[PDB]
Amino acid sequence: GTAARAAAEETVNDILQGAWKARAIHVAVELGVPELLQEGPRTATALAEATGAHEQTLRRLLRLLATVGVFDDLGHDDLFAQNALSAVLLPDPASPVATDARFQAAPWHWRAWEQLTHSVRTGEASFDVANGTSFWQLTHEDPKARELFNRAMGSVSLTEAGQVAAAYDFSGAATAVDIGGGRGSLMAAVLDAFPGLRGTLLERPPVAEEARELLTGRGLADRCEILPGDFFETIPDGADVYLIKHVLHDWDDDDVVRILRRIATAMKPDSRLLVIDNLIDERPAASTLFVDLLLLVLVGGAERSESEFAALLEKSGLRVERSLPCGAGPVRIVEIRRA
Amino acid sequence: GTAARAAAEETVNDILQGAWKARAIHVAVELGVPELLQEGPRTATALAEATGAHEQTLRRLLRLLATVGVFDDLGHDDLFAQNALSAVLLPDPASPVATDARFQAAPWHWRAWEQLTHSVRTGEASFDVANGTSFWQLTHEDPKARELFNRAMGSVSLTEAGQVAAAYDFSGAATAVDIGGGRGSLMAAVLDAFPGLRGTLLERPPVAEEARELLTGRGLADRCEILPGDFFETIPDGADVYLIKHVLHDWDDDDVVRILRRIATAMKPDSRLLVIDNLIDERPAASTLFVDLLLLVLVGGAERSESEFAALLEKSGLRVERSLPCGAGPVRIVEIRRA
Amino acid sequence: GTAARAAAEETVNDILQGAWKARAIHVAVELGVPELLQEGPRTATALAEATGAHEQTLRRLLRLLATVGVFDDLGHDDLFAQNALSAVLLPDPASPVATDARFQAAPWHWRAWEQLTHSVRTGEASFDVANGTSFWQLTHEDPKARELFNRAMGSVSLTEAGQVAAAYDFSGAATAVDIGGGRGSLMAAVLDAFPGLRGTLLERPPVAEEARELLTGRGLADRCEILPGDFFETIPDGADVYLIKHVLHDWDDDDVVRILRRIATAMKPDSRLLVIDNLIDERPAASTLFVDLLLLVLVGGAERSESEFAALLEKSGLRVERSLPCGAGPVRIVEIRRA
Amino acid sequence: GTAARAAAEETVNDILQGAWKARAIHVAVELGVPELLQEGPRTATALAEATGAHEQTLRRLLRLLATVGVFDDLGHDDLFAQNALSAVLLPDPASPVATDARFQAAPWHWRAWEQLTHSVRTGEASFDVANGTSFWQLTHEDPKARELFNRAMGSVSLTEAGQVAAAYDFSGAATAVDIGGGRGSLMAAVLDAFPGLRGTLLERPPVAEEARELLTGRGLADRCEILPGDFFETIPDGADVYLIKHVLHDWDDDDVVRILRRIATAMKPDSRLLVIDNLIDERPAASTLFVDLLLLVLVGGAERSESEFAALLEKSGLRVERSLPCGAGPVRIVEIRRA
Numbered sequence A, B, C, D: 001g002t003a004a005r006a007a008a009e010e011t012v013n014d015i016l017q018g019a020w021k022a023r024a025i026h027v028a029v030e031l032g033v034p035e036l037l038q039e040g041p042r043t044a045t046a047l048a049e050a051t052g053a054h055e056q057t058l059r060r061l062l063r064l065l066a067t068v069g070v071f072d073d074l075g076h077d078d079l080f081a082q083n084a085l086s087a088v089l090l091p092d093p094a095s096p097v098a099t100d101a102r103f104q105a106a107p108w109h110w111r112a113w114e115q116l117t118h119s120v121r122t123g124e125a126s127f128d129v130a131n132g133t134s135f136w137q138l139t140h141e142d143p144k145a146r147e148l149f150n151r152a153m154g155s156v157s158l159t160e161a162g163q164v165a166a167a168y169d170f171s172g173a174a175t176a177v178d179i180g181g182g183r184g185s186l187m188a189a190v191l192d193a194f195p196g197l198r199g200t201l202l203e204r205p206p207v208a209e210e211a212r213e214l215l216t217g218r219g220l221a222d223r224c225e226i227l228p229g230d231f232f233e234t235i236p237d238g239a240d241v242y243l244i245k246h247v248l249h250d251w252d253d254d255d256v257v258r259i260l261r262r263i264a265t266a267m268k269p270d271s272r273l274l275v276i277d278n279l280i281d282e283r284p285a286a287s288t289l290f291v292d293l294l295l296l297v298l299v300g301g302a303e304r305s306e307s308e309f310a311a312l313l314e315k316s317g318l319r320v321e322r323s324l325p326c327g328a329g330p331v332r333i334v335e336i337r338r339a
Ligand SMILES: Nc1ncnc2c1ncn2[C@@H]1O[C@H](CSCC[C@H](N)C(=O)O)[C@@H](O)[C@H]1O
Pocket: A136, A153, A154, A156, A157, A179, A180, A181, A182, A183, A186, A202, A203, A204, A207, A229, A230, A231, A232, A244, A245, A246, A247, A250
């Protein structure tokens, strides 16, 4: 009765305090604490001097983090040490969690969440009202913002890329086009896995240059054309396979139909389109739904079920051939042809 | 091996997503969803209309919350129901979690956390740099912020008031003064329990009048004077007992000493001071340390151990006599005499 | 005859070119190439940009290393990949070979070998002639040089430490002294394994502070005295056990006797000295003789046999009681008493 | 995996110790050990006295060298003996390996390698940075250095001279000019095989005189003019055939173009230029690339493919007429005419 109510109150309070737990991690990565603990334990004093932090306050922060499992408090000599949890925060372009922590550390990321109520009232991004500009405009104009986002997306993509290349038989295709392909890890993985294939990566001009760097340094520049462009205006015509991964979930129904219709126009009767995205099924995991809420906040996007995609595909002159599993999580490969 | 790293990564990712879980609760309380579920389940459609939310977006929010245990998703007819965790969020001035959730929903609250890095770099409140005004100034100028705060503090105080009145033998005291006594629940509980006692409450003018309401409404108006204003001016000489609850932890060391020295000069030789606040001991709970960090963010304050308070008292002409338990959290009553 | 001579000439020419093969590895490791290849093959161009190398020249270097089995030259698209031998060079504080390669990369290390002829003509170290200063003096003044030495030594001494602690029973000793104990890895392992024991670490002042940091971090600061000093002047008096590991092989016969004689006079009749070092016989492995030659080059030292040590100990008024195995290597423990 | 990693580590360590193995050979030839073992086995004691070495240390060196196959350690009575590998180290102006070993023994040769990293960072020779002077300048000013170099070059040249003379038809020519012809073995071999031919040898002054001695001794003094000169300045014009062997690989692209323009200017329209050098083709031998790296370290040069030479020749008004094999190895004769 009373004890049950008190337990519920404590459970909910832990949820509220969870916001501060996350922010403490953001500050630890922003300051570079985990990187400073790779060669044994260090004192709060020493960590404060190296990071430019206020000593007493960094000590409070580190005590708190250790209390919730991040870093170990050695309990003597003012020492703190790396542990299993703090270790996953080490900067690494291949780590989703490490890149995401640094992405989320940005004030404009946190501020979009400040205005979550706006998104819940509109179905639109809160990013604009919070930050005075859109997520796409910020990442277009601001190289630091672009870098934080592209790293966080890029780490996720590196993992998925190998999975896609292993889950779909591209052996029949001579040409592939990756629409909004980010830094190009998906195209790189598929090209590596299918030596006869050639590709084109289409991206926003600044991002396209980053993809050029990744693809060139991996020895793939002579097999992949880089196309700076806008997928609302341009889709290269007549390729065997088109790929679009974690793009459509950024866009509302109208904008998805715009994209799909332009893709449909570019497709040959024998062409295939692979929509590669998070699919909502009957019992989505909490994590899948958290990412759905992030899409809402940043760009007014949303995850969709296969039937929701199928409806939009129909309005675009396309139809689902089949859907294939792709590694762990909600990601699926939806193979699509012209109707 | 790599199975351990995977678990470490999921654990940290859950921490990051916890910020969003907190914000979803903030939005649910801002919109007033819990109070609409008191007469049986309701559809997301009806809840959205009642609250001014976008139907599909509120549905997403509620779906997410239910997957993490807050509200029940019935799984048919768009229905959601109250559950043990959501019931905790019902508007009720006696509920610490409900009032705190609604306080945290305010954009200036979340925005203080946006600039946590500033606090870690400086030892000073991030609230001021985030919001362009101090917490105290904001609660002076904006009656909505004032109300959110006074409710959040008043709910906690309601629980504490009876515990204090029962832990400390006030018999033999003729006069008591509560310094910054909020809405007066502490003063009310002590007066109830000790009919001989006459009281004086000091507070900023707006909440002083709120205290007058509470005390009057409880038939104690004749036994307690209300002195609105800065307590530095209003602190009466010659009272038998002075009380100060959840005030000193709002202030840095030097400001605490300023307050203590001011109280000392007002105390008769046989008077007692009760500092009632959260004490850090050798085994502080995570939730205790989270509140310490919140104090830094909002007002530049901090929680202290007994010996830390003892050092400040000894800069102020005061001495610890006894330290009494109060409830089952970190609250203690520190009984103090003039040196 | 003609063919056999040609084969002999090729074998010797391969030996000569082997010097350049070594240096090429030194440069690859100094530049950090192997680290850059952990995520798959990359172009010489991209590797050059990332390392600050001249593109054409790094390509030459990698192409050459690949022809002798270090890294793989993919033979297309300017790509190079990690292979079994290059992976050995990854920066790992636990790797003897990787840390040694970085140590040998130093110009002052290579320069000592420049004057090998001097050592063969005189029996003295070539390091001093070539570098204009001794190895000890350089590592005392140059913290960057000392750090390279530290990492190379540490990679092994950390494993040796646990081995000694498990191989000799210190259960009966109250006090131990590690003479020239490095950063204190040995002392730490022994103190961990023998809770009743107290220690003293004697080291050159700069190193003593390094040991302080290590032992403090291991929670042993209360159980081990740090003594900055010079073992040619000072040996702490009256300890139960003295340890001297990989020190004596740094010194010529007359210096060994000087050290041993100060140890003898500090010893109680029941004290024991443990000399822990490579004990050779009259037909060692090539690698062991290579290390003996390095001792000559760097510090004018040499590996010795038990008999040679015994001879020197007897000259110092010390007596070998017996010797013991530890580490399944050339490394043994010689247990010694006052004669 | 466990065994494989240890195998790799040992292999890499062996590569590292290979530098010391090479230096040990350098010392043995510098001291003149091999020439003392041609009349039977000798003790280290006798070898040390004969060579001015420290007895104990030479014994260390010889025992080490024998364990890796150079000299035989008889394993009794302190005796050592010549073996197949040490025999090729005997002083012989006609032996490439013996003369190269003694050239490499020089401290300034080894020191160029000390600064390999500089070359890899800049594309420039490390010799100058390491030795405070250029290779050409040192060999101009230091008669000992000049002799070591000229002997090492001259032994290789003796082996090649007969090959060139027998691989190209000099019948139609009346005059020949060897540009940077070293000690004249090439010119000598060509004059021998072609009685009607008259030669001019262009070399640095000190070198020119050594050429004079060789050609005089061969009875060709009246058939070959000796021309002290600088091929950046002076090329005798009007000769039928110009020869340039192992010179162009000493120079960078711009400097090769300078030399080529000089030669082009000097050639008659029906003249031929023979560039005789190591050619890089598909899948070059390791030893070929080792020499390429040595060129960089010593003089800032490089080995080239025929296509690379063709590019430079084209920039210089010259054209490849045909390429001919020359002996066994990477050496080829590139026959060239005016464009
Ligand atoms: N109008 C437009 N034209 C082309 N690309 C666009 C675009 N608007 C957004 N994008 C790109 O859409 C991408 C969505 S993030 C997904 C990136 C990549 N396919 C991956 O899976 O990792 C971003 O890289 C962004 O640059």
